[PDB]
Paper text:
These complexes include a 10 nm assembly, resolved at 2.0 Å and comprised of two face-to-face pentamers of the Cap molecules, and two 17 nm assemblies comprised of 60 Cap monomers in the absence and presence of ssDNA, determined to 2.5 and 2.3 Å resolution respectively in the same space group, arranged as 12 pentamers. Each Cap monomer was comprised of a canonical viral jelly roll built of two, four-stranded antiparallel β-sheets, with sheet one comprised of β-strands B, I, D, G, and the other sheet comprised of β-strands C, H, E, F.
X-ray diffraction to 2.0 Å enabled the atomic coordinates of the 10 nm complex to be elucidated. The assembly buries an extensive surface area of 13,650 Å2, of which 60% is associated between monomers contained within each pentamer, and 40% buried at the interface between the two pentamers. Monomers within each pentamer are arranged radially around a central pore of ∼7 Å, with Tyr115 exposed at the surface of the pore, and Val117 lining the inner surface. Each monomer within a pentamer associates with two adjacent monomers, burying 1,660 Å2 of surface area, and these interactions are mediated through salt bridge (SB) interactions and an extensive hydrogen bonding (HB) network. Interactions between the two pentamers are also extensive, with every Cap monomer forming interactions with two Cap molecules in adjacent pentamers, burying 655 and 415 Å2 of surface area at each interface. Thus, in the absence of DNA, Cap preferentially forms 10-mer complexes, where the highly accessible ARM domains can mediate nuclear localization and DNA binding.
Residue numbers in the entry:
A (entry chain I), D (entry chain C), E (entry chain H), G (entry chain B): 46 to 170, 189 to 198, 206 to 239
B (entry chain G), C (entry chain J), H (entry chain E), J (entry chain F): 46 to 170, 189 to 198, 205 to 239
F (entry chain D): 46 to 170, 189 to 199, 205 to 239
I (entry chain A): 46 to 170, 189 to 199, 204 to 238
The structure:
Amino acid sequence: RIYTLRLTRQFQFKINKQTTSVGNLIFNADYITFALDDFLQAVPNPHTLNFEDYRIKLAKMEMRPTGGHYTVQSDGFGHTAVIQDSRITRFKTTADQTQDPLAPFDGAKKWFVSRGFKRLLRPKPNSARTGWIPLGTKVRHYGIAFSFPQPEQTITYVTKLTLYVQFRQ
Amino acid sequence: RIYTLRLTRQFQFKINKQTTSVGNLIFNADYITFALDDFLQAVPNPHTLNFEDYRIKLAKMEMRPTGGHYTVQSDGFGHTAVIQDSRITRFKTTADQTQDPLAPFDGAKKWFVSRGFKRLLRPKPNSARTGWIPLAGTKVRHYGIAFSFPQPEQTITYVTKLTLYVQFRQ
Amino acid sequence: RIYTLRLTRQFQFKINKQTTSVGNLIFNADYITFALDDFLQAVPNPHTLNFEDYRIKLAKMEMRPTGGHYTVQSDGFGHTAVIQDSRITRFKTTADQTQDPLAPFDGAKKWFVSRGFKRLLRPKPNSARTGWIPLAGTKVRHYGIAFSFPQPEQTITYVTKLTLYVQFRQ
Amino acid sequence: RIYTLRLTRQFQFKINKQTTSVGNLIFNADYITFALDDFLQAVPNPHTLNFEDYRIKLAKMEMRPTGGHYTVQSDGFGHTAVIQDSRITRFKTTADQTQDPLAPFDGAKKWFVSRGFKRLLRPKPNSARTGWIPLGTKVRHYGIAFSFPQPEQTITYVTKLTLYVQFRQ
Amino acid sequence: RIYTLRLTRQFQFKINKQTTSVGNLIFNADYITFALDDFLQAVPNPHTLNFEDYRIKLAKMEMRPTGGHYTVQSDGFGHTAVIQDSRITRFKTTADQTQDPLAPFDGAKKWFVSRGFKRLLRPKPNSARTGWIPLGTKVRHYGIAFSFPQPEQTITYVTKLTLYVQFRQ
Amino acid sequence: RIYTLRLTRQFQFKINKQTTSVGNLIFNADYITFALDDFLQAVPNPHTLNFEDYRIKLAKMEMRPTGGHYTVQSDGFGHTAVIQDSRITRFKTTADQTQDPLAPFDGAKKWFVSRGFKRLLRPKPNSARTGWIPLQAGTKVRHYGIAFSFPQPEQTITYVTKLTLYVQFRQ
Amino acid sequence: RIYTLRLTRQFQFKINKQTTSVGNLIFNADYITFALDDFLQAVPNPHTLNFEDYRIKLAKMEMRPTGGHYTVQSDGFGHTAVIQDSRITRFKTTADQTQDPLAPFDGAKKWFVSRGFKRLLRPKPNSARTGWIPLGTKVRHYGIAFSFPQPEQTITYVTKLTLYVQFRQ
Amino acid sequence: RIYTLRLTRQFQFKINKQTTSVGNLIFNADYITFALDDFLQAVPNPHTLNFEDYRIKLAKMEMRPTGGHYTVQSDGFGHTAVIQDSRITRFKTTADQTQDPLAPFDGAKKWFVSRGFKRLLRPKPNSARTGWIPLAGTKVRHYGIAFSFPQPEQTITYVTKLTLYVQFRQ
Amino acid sequence: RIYTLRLTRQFQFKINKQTTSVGNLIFNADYITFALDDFLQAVPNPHTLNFEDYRIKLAKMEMRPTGGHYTVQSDGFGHTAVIQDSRITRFKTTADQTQDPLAPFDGAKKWFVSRGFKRLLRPKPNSARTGWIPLQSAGTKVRHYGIAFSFPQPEQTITYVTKLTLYVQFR
Amino acid sequence: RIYTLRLTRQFQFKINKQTTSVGNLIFNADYITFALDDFLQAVPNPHTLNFEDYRIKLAKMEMRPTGGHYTVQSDGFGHTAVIQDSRITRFKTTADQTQDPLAPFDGAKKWFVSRGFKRLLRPKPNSARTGWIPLAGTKVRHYGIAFSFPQPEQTITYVTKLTLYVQFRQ
């Protein structure tokens, strides 16, 4: 018997207007990781239940523009990629690049800057094989990265993350 | 915090060939009710976990023909209806009916005998208002789905799967 | 304020196998009319409620094969037509015809004998203009839907469901 | 001002089982032409109205199997073709042919023998140019031909023809 | 025998421009409840009929922008949730929230601020079980709540509520 | 034998910017009726053809914005309703309403102000039962009818309206 | 044996802003005819081949806005109509019209001024019956007309015409 | 200037009932090639027109069952594959195979034996690059489409139509 | 740089007619596992190409009826389930079951006996985390799990053609 | 056995506002070619593997507006065309044209300036027939896709992504 718990949190994300080499195409990127404790603030504590292990079965990231940005105002496209190891940490690019850093990655999916994206993924921490983790709740799971060409104007987004967490006795 | 558990069970159902007033249209009906205990045989009891109460959020009934019955073989249509009280029990009538007993009911939906059906429902048992039942508690019966059918010229066997989507609260 | 009441009844219909001029195409037809009293067997008279008038806003006829007839077994096509006057009464044809009697009618819709049909219509009885009839009153005949068919090689039995959408006003 | 009249008639059509060269693929064909008088027998005549001319705007042929033939019982495919002159008459095939006689024709459309077909066409008779004809009603309009590979068993069809006729004063 | 009556009413709704913590993501929410007297006039009226009980079978809320707001103008997304008791009242928030108050709820559905939303629900008042209430018509039914991230500019909406009410003798 | 004639005419319609109770939600409405004479501007009387009766089988109203109005610019929604009697005439509202006057009506359909609408209807005038009206006065018989409501917008919106009549004549 | 040749040409078309009866609805219209020589400027001549006759089987007209016009900017709707004789010429009206001149015509199809339109047609010149013309190439074929309510601002379009021409030996 | 010509021809194809290792899964295959001369039997030669060269831009193969075979009668699935050189000839196949010979090939697409298939392809013969062939020239063989199938329990007859879309330029 | 190789093999599978508890509903099940060596007999070992590791990114199982079985002949439904450990091995049932053994499993998907099924999965063998396995071959024989499928026992025997597809990555 | 590799690169493309013959319709065009070395870097690299040959099975070009251009702001339509030899070079037009230079071409596909386009193609370099090239080598240029456009009233900037689907064999 597997019990499932859905958790969610939100935050703002900004893509800043291009200020260097204006008129040329440059890319940047960022990334998101997942830990059960990131989502256990407004929620009672699972350890008080007689569950032995938990597993992050599925995660969802949805980032959509706000601040009055026009969806019909084109700002190019970047990519999203599911990267399931610590290597993802290098994708909060400190320097601008001339090429999209995530387009070459396995399973890279295009997304349009002015419309945002929604993507499902299976983030990864016997645990190494199945993902079942003893209750622990701070174990980092990787992960989703997203790239973008730098736009002419700053764009603000609302990001919602959703965890689909499994528990077994 | 709401935890969700999916449970399922299956069984055979048979619509027997018409042997009475053959050549004329007659209807019968049957029904299904839901209790958490119906689904807790291969599964430990959730109260061994420190859950306070449970609620049957959703139920699904899918009944599909087997035994070699042809789906393209027309055997008319009956109806399904969600009936959320003990009154549903009156619907497996020992005697045949001349009219479809469920067609008049609120939310009745047609189904073709040779195809079967799939239907979702919210079966119902302060608990009387919310549906939360303390974790004998697992045996509270929830109602309910009835299904009617015109009697066919030949017997039809079905595979039925029931699914419970059960909520547990901390 | 308009209150709506949905009523339904079912019956068997049969298209008999062709026995005359076998091997040639012949057509027959039948028709259905609607009266509130046809549907009030299981319901008290709405006049016991303080309703003054009623109106048959909409009617639905669904006729689907049964008796094991194969839907993939081709038996040609006839037509359905909404006929809102006494002329419809001539369409329970006592004699066979060489042409489809309903195909020429305004709004005629093709239907395949082996599949049946479903059709909505607005049957017709200040009453003459609006359809509002004082609540005798429940027996006013409303017309109407006719359906034609080429005579098949073998007898086909159908289950017919009729639905009335009846309006009542305050 | 154009007034439109819809006329229809039906008849049985039969494709006989192959009795020659059994086991080999052969094709035959037939055709249909349209004249207003073909459809006016059960219809009060337009002659009684003060219309000057008529024109066959559109014609429809629908031929569907009957006699208990199974639609899932495959019997190959032939073609339909719109042929707008007297040449069509040669397509009531006297002799079996080794190739589909209509497949090469302009606008030929496949149809499956066990399903039948539905096809719209603009049959053709200043009248030669526009189609307007003085009220006359026996002018022949061409036309639709249909071919078929000869099946192993006889198949009977119900055929409905529909005329969409325009009238002007 | 069940007789059905459809009732409807409309009103304006405003999401005010963000004036606190400007530049940061904050959420607010509101809610709607349903009483038959919200929709009824003195004429015509079901009380004058001989019905014994009524039941709100279904309710519909549709809220759509007006005032010239651009639908292609992105303003993020909030959530709707069906809440079937008086607790819903705590979602008319006086204090702004850093997290979406309805996203965690069972059955929460995303909606985009600049688009509005349409949602069906079964609001709740043996009456507690079936919903049948003696005619009375002031009984309050719950309920639908909706959240939103505070936008940069005020947005005005047209809201239509619809009740599908059943009556029995 | 039924002969069908399709007729059409167009005109401009305007919803004026709200000038009363500005900032609050108010509704207005208007309506359209149909007479064969409305559409026979350029066609001889069908009676000169040997037709005896006519019947308005179907009518269509399509109203779409013009004047550069943005379809993506939201201006709320009103309703359309088919009203087949003289009661429709009261929907040329001289006074503003706080509620949508057509939303409660049987068959009311929502439409978005910034998009316009298209709707089919069967307008109504033995004639009372069937709709067949003698030709000769007959062509001026008014048929009812479609009404449409709207919340008053912040700015004036101009529309193009096309009406289409599907008229039957029998022998 | 029928050989087919596809030819295409483009040009600019303009609907000028309304200057007469400003504030009121007025209509205008224009039209397009087809001759093989209109399309043989950058293509070798077919008579160098041993083709006896040619026939314009199909024509396509596509007119789409340019010059930065917003497709979401409503400017009403007009109609297109296929008119297969020389009378089509009367539709380039020197005077504005109070009604849409093409809406009454058989087969008229609505088109929205701010989106443009695309339409297929069979333009018309034994030749009158079939359309086969001896190679001749200047024969005029009619034709497609399009009407429009006059807009508040000028709208520029790109028009592409395509001919599908048949040749037989 | 490019002129286009559509040509077509038909023939019967049969998949014989399994007679070897009956009860076990075995595969066979066949193939089709294209030459303009295959399609010019009822057509004059384009060189009588002053065309210099031709090119097969596109080819279509459609093979559909006949002889009364039931499309709902499951007989497994094989594959089709476009193979653009003479190696296509290697699927004779003189010996039955235990594996589907075309499933591994690039671009292989599944087809169900009881339904047949339709597929478009670009068959291939400066000419080696462009495909333009001077107008013996009409006999250049273009490759090609192969199709495999698991051997059925009963013989299945098909009608096959090939279509050529040939370009000619001045 | 990731290089992808698609490999496929086929075989026959049979569901035998019910001979125990005839007239009652019983279920059985079977399962499939994946090893690169199961698909690499015609192809030389990818280690002869200068590849160091391989990883089974994706696997597909498609099982469709043959032997003349009618797709319109109903024979109920079972389930498929992705099981990524040794537990799958117990699902070639030695005994008939009164309940569907795979219906309770995470991600179980219904399939109809008379139609067959098609399902994609990610079968599982730093290798334990990522799936990258060294080439040498012991590596190419590492068993990956896995897909199990259950079925109600039918009244007559049904034969299927099964095609397995491996999507293998090399770096 | 065929191993497949996906490669991608991006760059900015710009259609400049019209400055000549302002007010009249004129066309210009450009083109893209493909070489494996356009997409490769010094490490990792295919040469270090024991592959005999490679070939570009498929290429994809996607060009989409950026810089804040409104997709709903109409700027007409041009065409894309696959041109598989060096003649394509003549389509980076130095002089403005009154007619669309690619619209007459075989397989020309319309595209709207304000929306951009996505197109698949088979670019071309026994090698001339099949595309297989020995690992010249990775520098062989493959042709090719050209795209035309009516000159707009304002400058439009695009992001372009090219994708190569490369096959390798031992």
